[PDB]
Amino acid sequence: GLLCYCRKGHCKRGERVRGTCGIRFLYCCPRR
């Protein structure tokens, strides 16, 4: 739902990139 997480290098097979968290970190939001 309305909750996203920072991922290192890339998101998991389910989380879509929403933005950037920092150097080598991406803010990904799950597709559910």
UniProtKB/Swiss-Prot annotation:
Function as written in the Swiss-Prot or TrEMBL entry: Host-defense peptide that has antimicrobial activity. Exhibits activity against Gram-negative E.coli (in vitro). Probably contributes to the antimicrobial barrier function of the small bowel mucosa.
Family designation: Belongs to the alpha-defensin family.
Disulphides: 4-29, 6-21, 11-28
Intracellular or extracellular location(s): Secreted; Cytoplasmic vesicle, Secretory vesicle
Protein's organism: Mus musculus
UniProt-recorded name of the protein: Defensin alpha 4
Tissue: Paneth cells of the small bowel.
Superkingdom in the source lineage: Eukaryota
